[PDB]
Amino acid sequence: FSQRLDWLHTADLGFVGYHAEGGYTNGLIQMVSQWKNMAMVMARPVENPGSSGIPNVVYVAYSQADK
Amino acid sequence: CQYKIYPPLGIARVGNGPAIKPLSLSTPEVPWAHLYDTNVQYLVTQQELEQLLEEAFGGNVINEISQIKTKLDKFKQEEIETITGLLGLSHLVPQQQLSRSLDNLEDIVQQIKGALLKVLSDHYLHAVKKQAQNFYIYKCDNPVEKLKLTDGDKVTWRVEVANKKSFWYDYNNALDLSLHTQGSGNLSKNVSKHRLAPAMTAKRRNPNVITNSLRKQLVISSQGSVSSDNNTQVPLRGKFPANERHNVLQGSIECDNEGVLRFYAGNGISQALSPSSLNTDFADNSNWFDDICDGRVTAVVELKNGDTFEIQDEQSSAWVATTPPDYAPQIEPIVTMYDMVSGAALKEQDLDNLTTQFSDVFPILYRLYRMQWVNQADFTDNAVNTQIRELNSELGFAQLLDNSASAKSLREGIFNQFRNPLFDQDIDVDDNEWVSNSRIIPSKDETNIAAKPATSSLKLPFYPNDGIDYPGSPVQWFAIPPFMYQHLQNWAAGDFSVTQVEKESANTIEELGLFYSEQFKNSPNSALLCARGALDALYGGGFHPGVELTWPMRHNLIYSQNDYVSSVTPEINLLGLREFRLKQDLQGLNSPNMYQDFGHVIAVDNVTASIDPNSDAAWLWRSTPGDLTKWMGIPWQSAAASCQAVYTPEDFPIPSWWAANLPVHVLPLARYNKFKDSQSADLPEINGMTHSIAQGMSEETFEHLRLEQFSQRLDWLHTADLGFVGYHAEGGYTNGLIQMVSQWKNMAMVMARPVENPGSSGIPNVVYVAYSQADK
Ligand SMILES: [Mg+2]
């Protein structure tokens, strides 16, 4: 529950691959095509959290690279 | 063996001009035929567009345009696309723009023939005309006589092409540089033997596509057939990725009533699958495709009586390859692809048995001399070209045709300025490593440690070469190949012959040039002339990778046949005429080796294995469609933009790669218009000056201004906007590669133009002027 991912890493914004440059400017350029693949946050249930400390309603980011 | 195709290796060049005869060019079928033709038009002119349009208005058309004049007494969908077609022109411009051209209207013939001339000129005005190859069927006994069709007869041509650039390996350098050999006419054994420019391993292009099955998608392919009984043009259209997805016009084919095949290349369109995928490398850019092609040309001759002759063997069939445009068609490379064919069949160790006529050496001097129109070093910094000018000054050029001792010192003094392709001069040996003591071409990655001062002069020509990657290698710089160097040494020593009629036309280099030109024009073997003419405009070095083709061409193993047959004329060799043919996979596009490779890398080890024809690798030399061009840069525009100058710390001379076909320094139109007029002209503007100013100055001064203008040469890369235009424009190498994809079609085109009265200015009667929209 505690592992949070950079939203800019939810799709390929220029940082993927051996020696990908990544960086600010490649993110601007790649977003033109990749905006439609960025993660989409949506409320989802945890039906029996028990004593874990996870709330019954979580907000989860959905993308394809995201799993 | 009864019928054969010529040329054996046809060449077609891409252009955005249309694929029609009046507005296209033809690959040379005779060497040197038009070197001084001052009426050439290698870009589509307004005149050609008007005469094209007038013909389409012949002549029914006005009849039936006045048969429409009455029933308007705007247009409308139905009378739009009836006028449309009639004028046969949607094969030139999309029907829609043709229609919204007239949809938008308000002598009726003229505003039709006027609104449509505006759409034609926007599409094609100043367009790079395509250079198409004519293929001919010849009869044999050995060719003599074209084919002549009788009524009941028919020829059917077939063509299969492919582009495998995106499928193939990175181009780092020529792999044959480390291949063990006894030496050929094109490459000395010293290069490999002494490791002067080691061949480098090369990884795959588009490496993220894995498995041979999926990599087949990286190969673009197409095929078509045309006959003598129908001159309708057939497109050669493939798709990328192969069978999202873009259509790629690889070429167009046509057959006329007489049985001659005309091959047009593509429109020069290169593109990446994503706009953000930029082509920043000179050769290896993944995610890109271009419309370059090469393939297999076959035919079937079917007669009246039903006797069918099939031309599909390798000794009788032909090949075709498309290439970038020639931006200076009348300026020949110093060493051509034909020269590599000629040298491929020769052994280095047997060059002492070669025999030389002066016509064998003249082309080197003549070509190097005419390099002055495309390269500054050869205009201002080439001691041999200046000495030739001195000879012409005195009508004394014939002295170089003198084989006697009286002329030895003169012939030697020139011969000795030329680089030796043994690559064993101007070196000091470490320990063994051969290190040049002449001027090196440094890498861009600098080391702030003082250079070792050169002790030997820089030899000719001043061009980089296949070993440019290695500072201090003698192979960083280009040498004419061993067999032509042999010709030049024989000439220097006096072991050469020449006829008296040649001496009598040799007062200047130009006088002897047109004599040798007429020899070609009156040579009787049109078949072999057409085979040579197809390759004589192509470069034959250096290969990094080159412009049109690359290093596999310099090896005899790529040819199934390569034999000398004849002098150009009985007494005048002029480097000879040869019968040559490529090794071909008779299955073509359906060959099991159409998609062969060597795994994760290619290396010289693979080429070594490919020598043995029994090997798993011998397929390398048995070309399937796409095999000749796959080595070249993808897209070709980045390679061309990289095929320019390579600057040294020393300013002069400026090294240039392949300036005969991709010029480096040109004479713009704008300068031509400032020196073509004589002071006598009766114009309000004379050479860019008012009538009053031009005629008020002394004649001395007028002529000096003419030659000052003539001497202003422009960087070819500055003839269109390649990223250097505008306030705080970055310019630079990489923006050139990127912008050439769109700007190749606006680059200046060099063409011969006249100077009616040069007077005493020093300007020649024939100049070669670079035309572009920027420089006008
Ligand atoms: Mg040229």
Side-chain angles (χ1 to χ4, degrees), chain A residues 29-30, chain B residues 274 276:
Chain A
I29 291 157
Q30 293 306 306
Chain B
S274 183
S276 63

mmCIF file of all heavy atoms in Angstrom, chain A residues 29-30, chain B residues 274 276:
data_model
loop_
_atom_site.group_PDB
_atom_site.id
_atom_site.type_symbol
_atom_site.label_atom_id
_atom_site.label_comp_id
_atom_site.label_asym_id
_atom_site.label_seq_id
_atom_site.Cartn_x
_atom_site.Cartn_y
_atom_site.Cartn_z
ATOM 1 N N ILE A 29 7.849 16.135 -24.836
ATOM 2 C CA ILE A 29 7.694 15.667 -26.214
ATOM 3 C C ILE A 29 6.828 14.411 -26.259
ATOM 4 O O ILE A 29 5.909 14.290 -27.075
ATOM 5 C CB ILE A 29 9.077 15.411 -26.847
ATOM 6 C CG1 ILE A 29 9.815 16.727 -27.062
ATOM 7 C CG2 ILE A 29 8.950 14.643 -28.144
ATOM 8 C CD1 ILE A 29 11.324 16.586 -27.138
ATOM 9 N N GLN A 30 7.135 13.437 -25.409
ATOM 10 C CA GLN A 30 6.408 12.175 -25.456
ATOM 11 C C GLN A 30 4.966 12.294 -24.966
ATOM 12 O O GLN A 30 4.128 11.492 -25.377
ATOM 13 C CB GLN A 30 7.140 11.117 -24.632
ATOM 14 C CG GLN A 30 8.493 10.711 -25.230
ATOM 15 C CD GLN A 30 8.369 10.263 -26.683
ATOM 16 O OE1 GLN A 30 7.579 9.367 -26.999
ATOM 17 N NE2 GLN A 30 9.144 10.882 -27.571
ATOM 18 N N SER B 274 6.897 7.433 -35.621
ATOM 19 C CA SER B 274 6.448 8.448 -34.685
ATOM 20 C C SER B 274 7.131 9.764 -35.035
ATOM 21 O O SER B 274 8.338 9.774 -35.283
ATOM 22 C CB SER B 274 6.779 8.060 -33.229
ATOM 23 O OG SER B 274 6.267 9.025 -32.324
ATOM 24 N N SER B 276 8.221 12.046 -33.229
ATOM 25 C CA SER B 276 9.293 12.408 -32.308
ATOM 26 C C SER B 276 10.552 11.572 -32.509
ATOM 27 O O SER B 276 11.540 11.781 -31.788
ATOM 28 C CB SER B 276 8.814 12.270 -30.864
ATOM 29 O OG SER B 276 8.477 10.924 -30.561
#
